From a paper:
TodS/TodT, a two-component signal transduction system, is responsible for regulation of tod operon expression in P. putida strains. TodS lacks a transmembrane region, and its N-terminal PAS domain (PAS1) binds a wide range of effectors, including toluene, to trigger increased basal autophosphorylation of TodS, leading to a phospho-signal relay to TodT and ultimately transcriptional stimulation of the tod operon genes by interacting with phosphorylated TodT in the PtodX promoter region (11–14). In the present study, we determined the crystal structures of the TodS PAS1 domain in complex with either toluene (an agonist) or 1,2,4-trimethylbenzene (1,2,4-TMB; an antagonist), as well that of apo-PAS1. The structure of each PAS1 domain is very similar to those described for other PAS domain structures, which consist of a five-stranded antiparallel β-sheet and three α-helices spanning residues 45–149.
There are two PAS1 molecules in each asymmetric unit, resulting in an antiparallel dimer structure. An additional α-helix (α4, residues 150–163) is located immediately outside the canonical PAS fold in molecule A. Remarkably, the corresponding region of α4 is completely disordered in molecule B. The TodS PAS1 domain constructed in this study did not include the corresponding helix region; thus, the antiparallel face-to-face dimerization observed in the TodS PAS1 structure may be an artificial consequence of the symmetry of crystal packing. During refinement of the apo-PAS1 structure, we noted a region of weak electron density in the hydrophobic ligand-binding pocket. The shape of the region is somewhat similar to those of benzene-derived compounds, including toluene and 1,2,4-TMB. Thus, we thought that the region of weak electron density observed in the apo-PAS1 structure may have originated from contaminants in the incubator (or the laboratory environment). It may also be possible that a cellular ligand, such as an aromatic compound, was co-purified with PAS1 protein. In the absence of a signal effector, the PAS1 sensor domain cannot provide a signal to HK1 via the flexible nature of the STR. This conformation cannot induce the functional dimeric conformation of HK1 to enable autophosphorylation.
Residue numbers in the entry:
A (entry chain B): 42 to 163
B (entry chain A): 39 to 163
The structure:
């Protein structure tokens, strides 16, 4: 559905723009994180594993690969509280096909109706 | 400095309705996001120098909405809270999702006013 959180990154994952709702959820101001890697921002700082995971998702998108996965973030009450989020990274190319930005999107799934994945039988 | 690499940017939906705009663009136009959110980009005050400028921006957004990349120079009410005209190198990038469907348009612009002034001076014969 239309995102709840959204951010624009350059192709190295550095933060360019972030909507107010995401900044309020993480307890972060844009000026504090702008120009620096997205994985360093507080949303991704539950642990060294969550940080590393997000750096890896940014590397995958920076390569042209679309990312979608459920993740946990410090994303509620000014960075105090963990929420689960459906998270996506869209590589944005220019007319020649070179990746120039990344779009980070998320929606809070903490109250979303419990859903079943499609699992292979084999 | 380090951040000079980017100036105005906005995120539109696939039909050009406004979703997000950065503060440099809003302050330069004297516009708040709430006056323009969910309504066509070409109705926002940057593009209202005349009916011509508005009609061209609507064409540019329809071009990008069809999946084509747009870049060209334009003039906007984009300095001193919308009070002054600046020339801008303006681009719209259609953004596709994983299935290849257009989901958003990225609007970017850089102020090239001093740049055109300099080109005109170097052009003097």
């Amino acid at each position: 559905a239309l995102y709840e959180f959204v951010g624009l990154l350059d192709a190295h994952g550095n933060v360019l723009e972030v909507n107010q709702v995401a900044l309020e959820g993480g307890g972060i101001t844009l000026e504090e994180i702008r120009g620096k890697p997205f994985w360093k921002a507080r949303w991704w700082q539950i642990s060294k594993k969550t940080e590393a995971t997000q750096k890896r998702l940014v590397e995958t998108a920076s390569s042209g690969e679309f990312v979608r996965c459920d993740v946990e973030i410090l994303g509620k009450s000014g960075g105090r509280e963990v929420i689960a989020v459906d998270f996506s990274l869209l590589p944005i190319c220019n007319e020649e096909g070179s990746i120039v930005y990344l779009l980070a999107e998320g929606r809070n799934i903490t109250d979303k109706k419990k859903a079943e994945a499609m699992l292979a039988l084999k």
